[model samples]
Target: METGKLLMELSNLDGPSGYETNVVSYIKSVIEPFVDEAKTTRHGSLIGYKKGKGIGKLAFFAHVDEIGFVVSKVEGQFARLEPVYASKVRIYTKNGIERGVIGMLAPHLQDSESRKKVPTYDEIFVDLSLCERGVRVGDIAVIDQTAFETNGKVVGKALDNRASCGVLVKVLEFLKRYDHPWDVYVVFSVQEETGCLGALTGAYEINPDAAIVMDVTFASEPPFSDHIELGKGPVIGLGPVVDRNLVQKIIEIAKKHNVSLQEEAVGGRTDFVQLVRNGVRTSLISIPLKYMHTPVEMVDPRDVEELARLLSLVAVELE
Candidate 1:
C-alpha cells in the first residue's frame, strides 16, 4: 500500500464524531481484501479481523472521526454554526454535500478593540448563499482541506486519527504476506472526538487479550516545546492508564526490529483509559501531529510507516 495515497484518502474524507459513515465505508472497502472478516458495531465502528496461527486476540484501534461543526440554525442565506473551527467547510445535507465558508467581519472595518477580539460562533456565520442545495439544521460540516504531501510530511484535515487509520491498513497489508500468531482486529472506531464512545462499545464487544490504541500526539513546533518531533518514530505512552507490561513488550519489539521510538506521559484522554477500565490491557502508540483539530494538521509519512512496522513485529511476538 502506498502510505501517502492511503493517508490522503483517509484524511480527505469527512467523518465528524457521530457522522462517520463515509469514513467507515471507505475503510471497509480497503481493508476487506486483507482481513478474514469485516464488520461494524452497532454504533458504526469498523472492525476487520484477521485470523492468526495461535491463541490470543490483539486489536489495534484508530478512530475515524474528525472534529467538525453542526448547523445550529438556518436563517435566510446564512447558517449558524455549532462546535468547531475552519474557514472552508463541506456541509453534509439531506440532498448532498455543499460548500461554504465561515463568514466573518472584515478586519479593516473593525475598531481596534473589536479587531483584537476573536470572533465567537455567534458572531460568525456560514455563507450558504452560493450553495445550490439548501443546508438544514443538524447538518454536519467538516474542514474542507484536502491532504497533500510536501517536504516529507502530509498535511490536511482529519490527520488526528485518520493517519493512524492509514497505519492500521498498512499493517494489515504487511500481515497479509506473513503468518502471525494471534487474531488481529483492526478497528476504525467512531465518535472519538465526542468522547471515546465508539471505542467504549467496540472494546466491550471485541474484548481482545491486549489492544494497542493508535492516536496522534502534539509535535514540537513554534510556541510549543515537546520532545515529540514529526520525523521521529511514533511516541509510546508511559503512564498509569497504559499497561506497563504491554508497553514494555512493545518497546522490546521496537528495539529488536531497530525501530526508533519516543516516550510520553500518557495523561491526556484517549481510548487507552476506556480499554483499561474495561479489563483489557492497552498500550498507546501516537504519531506526532501538528495543529491538531484544525484544517492544516500535519504528519510525517515516515512516522506512519515506522509505527506500522513496529506494530506488525509486535503482533508476531505477542502471546
Candidate 2:
C-alpha cells in the first residue's frame, strides 16, 4: 500500500496504550511480507526482524499506540471516561478524541465560573448520542479522527507516531529493493504514551549496536510550539538523552543528500529514555507535527517521505 493510504488506515485504528491489540494486528499484516521474521513480544509490542549481512545490529523504534480514554462507566447515553495515560488526561477531555468528544457545556452556558476551570475526570462524560449504540463500560473509545490530504497538508489523529510508523514501513519497503549489511529490527512499540514499557523490553531483548527512535516533534503554531514547521524536513533531536554522534551523522547525511534538516534541543522524551538507559546508543529523529495529541493532528506528506529516506540511509550507512 502507499504511504498516505497506510497512514490513514492505521490512524483510524483503535489502539490506545494497553489496549493495542487491534492496531498491533493491523501493523503486523502490513509489515509481515517485508520482514524475514515477525512476532508479538511477550511484553505486547509488534516486532519485525530483517536479517542482513553480519555487520551489526540496528533497531528502529516507533510507538504503535495513541493517547486515548477508556470507558469507566456508562449511564444512559452518557459515558464516564478515564485516561489511558494520565499525562494525557487533560488534553483528552479538553481537545476530544477522533470524531467524538467528552461533552462539556459551552462558556455561554457555563453553570458557574467553576465550570470554566479544567473539568475533572469524574466530571467529564462522553455523549455517544445515538442512544448508546452498543457502547459499553470499559470500551476504549478514541475520538474518531480521519486522515486526509488537502492543500498539501495531511491531518488526522495518531499522526504523532503513526506517521513515524509509516516511515518504518517505507524504510523496509525501500530496503527490500536493495541490499544492506546491517541486520535490522523494526519494532512498533506499545504503551509509549503511558510509559516506554514496550521499548524497554524490546531494546533489552534485541541488544542492538544502535537504536533509533522515530516520533513526532512539535511544529510551530502561534503561541505554542517549537520553531519547526510542517514540510520543513525532519527534526534531529539534540540533548543529553540522544547519541551525539548519531545526531551529527544525520545532519551530515541530510546535507549530502540535499534533504533539508531541522534540529531541536527539546524537553520532552520518546522511547529513548528507556532505550538509552538499557545501553542501546540511541538517536531521536522526529517529524514536525502541528497540534500534537489532538484530534486534528497535522503533518506534511513530504516530510514523512524525507524521514523514511534518512532512516533508510542510516540503516545502510551506519555499519
Candidate 3:
C-alpha cells in the first residue's frame, strides 16, 4: 500500500473549507503518476482520467478537504477557531485533548469562576506561533501537520476523505495490474465539508453516466453509535443522498464480491445529495472512520483496499 506516501501528503497540508490551495497542489502531484491526465478544476478539484472511448462516463470522487475551524477573530496572530458545528468542538478538544496548537481557553484574566463551559470560537483564541511581541492581525495557524499512524492502524489528521484519496491512488495501482472497458475519472474534490461546493462544478465539467462519491462515514463504535463497526468494510449509502438505481447496483456488486458492506441513510447535506440533486446518477461508498475531525482519526487499511477493488470491478463491468 502506498499508505505511507498518501497519508504523509494528506496530513502535512493545511486546507480549510473555502481555502483548499495546499491540498490542491499536493493532490495534483500525487495523481500525476497514476492517470492518463491529471487536471485541476476551476474551483480546485483534481481530476485524473482514463479513457475507453465509449458512450459512458463514470466518476469516482473523494473530497480533499477536512472539517477545520476558520478564523472568526484574529487577536494579533492568535486566531480564534470556529468549529464547523458542535461535534467539531467535542471532536477536537474533548476533555483537554488540545489537539496540538489548536483551540484555546481564555486567560485567567478573561474568566474566573464564571467560566462555565467550553467557549465558542468567538469566545476562544488560538496561539498561532506569534510571540506576543510582534504579532500581526491576520495570520493562520493550523492545528497540526504531522500524519503519523499509531500501532499499525491508520490514524492521523485529515483522513476524512484524504484516505479515500489514498485509496484512489491505490486503485490506480490496481488498474495498472489489470485493464478495464469503461472510461474512469477520479476527482479529488474541495469544500465537501462546508458544502459540496467543488462537486457541483466537477459534475458539470465532466458530466458522467454514473458517479461514485467515496468518503469516510462516522464509525458508530461504543461511546459513538451502534450503527457501525470497524474492520467490517465500507458503508454503502442509501436513500436521500444517493440514487436508488446506483444503490442497488452497489448492493449487487458487494454481494457478488462477498465484501462486507453496510447501509446508511444520508440526506440533503452529503456529496451524493449534491450529485443526484444536480441531475446525475450517483451513490456513495463510506469508509468507516472514528474521530471525524480531530488529529487522531482512524481507518482500516483492508477497508480502504476493498473499496478500491469494489469500485474497480463495478467500473469494469459497466456496459
Candidate 4:
C-alpha cells in the first residue's frame, strides 16, 4: 500500500482554504496510476472512478481539504494568521515556546494561574522573518505543511481529512485492479473544514443508490482518551449524520470479514453532519482520529490501508 509515503505526502502537503492547488495536484498523481478515470470538480475536488453497465452505483467519499491559517495582520517581519475554523488556540499559544510553530505567545515568562480564559486568533501572530525574508498580508502561511515523529508516531498537519482522502484514492486503486460488479465513485470532497461544500455538490450530481462518506473520527482508546487512539481500527458513525440502514449493511460486512470497528458519536461537527441533510442514502465510515483539526493530528498508516481494503470488499461482497 506504500502507506508511509502516502501518509507523509498527504500530511505535508499545503492545503488551507482556497489554496488547495498543491494537495489537489499531488492527490491526483497518487490516485491516477491506480484508477481507470480521474477528474476534478468545479470547486477543485478530485474524483476517481470505475464503472460497469447496469451495476448499482456506490459512491465513496473522503474530504481532502485541511484547516489552516490565512494572513490577517502584518508587522515588520511577521504576519499574524487566523485559523480557518474553531481550533486549539490556547494550547497553540502556550506551546509556542518551540519557536518553529511560532505560537501567539511564549508562556515561560508567565506562570501561576493564567488558565481562566483563552485569547483569540487575532491575538496570535507568526514571525515569518518577513523583514529577514519577504512576506505580505495577503500571503498565506502554510501552517500544517509539516511532517514529524513523536514516540514512534507520525505527527503533522491535515491528517484529519487527508488520511481519509488517501484511503479513498487507494480504494479507487483497488477497485481498478479488481472487477467489481457495481459502479464506484471515489470523491475527494472540498471545504469539509469550513462546510460540506464539495461533497454536497458531488453527492447530488452522482446520486448513487448507496454512498459511504469516509472521514477520520474520534479514536480515544488510550486511558486519557478512554476511547480514541490509533491502531484501534476505524470508527463507524452512530450520529445524526449516519444512515441507519446503510450502517446495518456495513455492520454485517465488517463482522463477516472480521474487520475491527468502533462506534463514534460526536456532537461537535463532522462532514456527516452536512451529508445526511441532503436526503441521500448515506453512511459515515471513519478512521479513528486523535487530536483532530490540529497540526499534530495523528493516525496509523495501517488503519488507512484497512479502510481501503474494507471499502473494496464492501463493493464486491454483497449478500
Ranking by lDDT: 1, 2, 4, 3
Q: After superposition, how far is residue 188 of candidate 3 from its true place, in Å?
A: 1.4
List candidate 4 segments past 4 Å from native.
Answer: 76-78, 85-122, 128-131, 148-152, 192-204, 219-225, 266-278
Number of the top-ranking candidate, with TM-score as the measure: 1
Give each prediction's root-mean-square deviation over alpha carbons: 4.2, 5.7, 6.0, 6.4
Tens digit of lDDT per residue, candidate 3, span 1-319?
3665566567667676656878878777766776788776667777778665565878887777765654566554455655441222211222332332344433545455544443454555555442323323333334565566665567777777678887787777666654677778887777743334355355446567888877778644334345866678888867565678777877787788887887666521245555556687877778888887676778877778888888877776654
Over the stretch 1-319, how does candidate 2's per-residue lDDT look in tens digits? 7667777887778787787888888888888888998877665787788888869888887888777777787765566777671212222233343234466433344457645443455566755553323556666656666678777877888888788888888888877865878888888888733334355355345577887788788743345455888889888878688878877876787778888978787534345656666777878788888878777788888888888887777777764
Q: State TM-scores per candidate.
A: 0.86, 0.82, 0.77, 0.78
Put down candidate 4 lDDT per residue, 151-196, tens digits, no spaces. Answer: 5456678887788887887787777666778777777766633334
Please list the C-alpha lDDT of all candidates, in the order they appear: 0.79, 0.72, 0.65, 0.66
Please rank every candidate by TM-score, starting with the best: 1, 2, 4, 3
User: Which wins on TM-score, candidate 2 or candidate 3?
Assistant: 2
1 versus 2: better TM-score goes to: 1
lDDT measured at residue 31 in model 2 versus the true structure, 0 to 100: 82
Tens digits of per-residue lDDT for model 1, 138-224: 888878897898998899898887898999998988887778888788878777332343443554455678888887887443454
Question: Model 4, poorest ten-residue lDDT window?
Answer: 89-98
TM-score of 2: 0.82
- The lowest-lDDT stretch of 10 consecutive residues in candidate 3 is 85-94
Question: What is the total number of backbone clashes in candidate 2?
Answer: 6
Residue runs of model 2 more than 4 Å from their true location after superposition: 75-77, 85-101, 104-122, 127-134, 192-204, 219-225, 267-270
